[PDB]
Design a protein around this ligand. Structure first.
Ligand SMILES: NC(=O)C1=CN([C@@H]2O[C@H](COP(=O)(O)OP(=O)(O)OC[C@H]3O[C@@H](n4cnc5c(N)ncnc54)[C@H](OP(=O)(O)O)[C@@H]3O)[C@@H](O)[C@H]2O)C=CC1
Ligand SMILES: COc1cc(-c2ccc(C)cc2)cc([C@@H](C)C#Cc2c(C)nc(N)nc2N)c1
Length: 225
């Protein structure tokens, strides 16, 4: 009932997302996008949830966690169960799946979560292909004289493009309405792939804000009593 949206910054063509527990770039504009998208709501009385694996949590600088103005959920298999408040702004869960079911109960949530953002990392994203309704992927490309950074963690692009289609034409409409983007929508070929979205450049990189949406499903079974 509440949308589940994975959100990620990935380097094309491998969709690399990390190296040695850290982001492989430092892009203030990309990070600003991430902040605004996850923080902002259309309804002023709601907040978003951000869910992340334990290793991702531990890599966020300590001055900046928990992420402000969002409900933070950290998942670890060594936590107690399925959704527990441990500090102001921090929930622990021992289960990505059960945590999502729990967050979705209108009795627990009072219909005051707008969206649930899944914010990483590799392990968590692997498991979220079947859980997310949408993906906000920042598609990052090294400009001509930019060294490709070393990377060790990757989005599952195969499974991605299996389950989802590039719905970037509807990106602007999908974002919370107060966000302001400086690009206009833009299709560009890059190493043999169509890259469609809203362009920025910063440091040695060009990047596009894109939206992926679940492909239409055939009606095989509805459960009847
Ligand atoms: N480019 C981007 O947009 C982003 C990139 N990243 C990158 O990803 C990398 C980190 O990814 P990765 O190492 O895979 O780690 P994760 O952040 O995905 O954390 C993995 C941990 O989460 C816990 N966990 C995983 N699945 C479950 C589950 N189903 N239920 C309960 N707990 C679970 C486990 O914790 P435990 O071991 O304690 O039991 C596991 O070791 C870093 O390089 C980081 O920079 C991260 C966020 C964004
Ligand atoms: C892997 O180490 C990390 C560090 C930070 C971080 C770094 C610096 C500061 C000042 C604040 C937070 C954030 C993250 C995670 C939570 C992220 C992210 C994410 C992004 C930047 N962009 C997009 N598009 N999606 C994301 N999930 C990880």
């Amino acid at each position: 009932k509440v949308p589940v949206v994975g959100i990620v910054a990935a380097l094309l063509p491998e969709m690399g997302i990390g190296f040695q527990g850290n982001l492989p770039w430092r892009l203030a504009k990309e990070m600003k996008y991430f902040r605004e998208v996850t923080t902002l709501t259309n309804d002023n009385s709601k907040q978003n949830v951000v869910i992340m694996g334990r290793k991702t949590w531990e890599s966020i600088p300590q001055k900046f966690r928990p992420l402000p103005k969002r409900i933070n959920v950290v998942v670890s298999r060594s936590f107690d169960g399925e959704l527990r408040k441990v500090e102001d702004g921090i929930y622990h869960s021992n289960s990505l799946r059960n945590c999502l079911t729990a967050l979705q109960s209108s009795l627990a949530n009072e219909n005051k979560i707008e969206r649930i953002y899944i914010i990483g990392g590799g392990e968590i994203y692997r498991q979220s292909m079947d859980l997310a309704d949408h993906w906000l992927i920042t598609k990052i490309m090294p400009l001509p004289e930019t060294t490709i950074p070393q990377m060790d963690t990757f989005l599952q692009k195969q499974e991605l493009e299996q389950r989802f289609y590039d719905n970037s034409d509807k990106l602007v409409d999908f974002l919370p309405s107060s966000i302001q983007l400086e690009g206009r929508l833009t299709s560009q070929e890059w190493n043999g792939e169509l890259v469609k979205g809203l362009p920025v450049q910063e440091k040695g990189y060009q990047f596009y804000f894109t939206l992926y949406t679940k492909k239409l499903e055939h009606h095989h079974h509805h459960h009847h009593h």
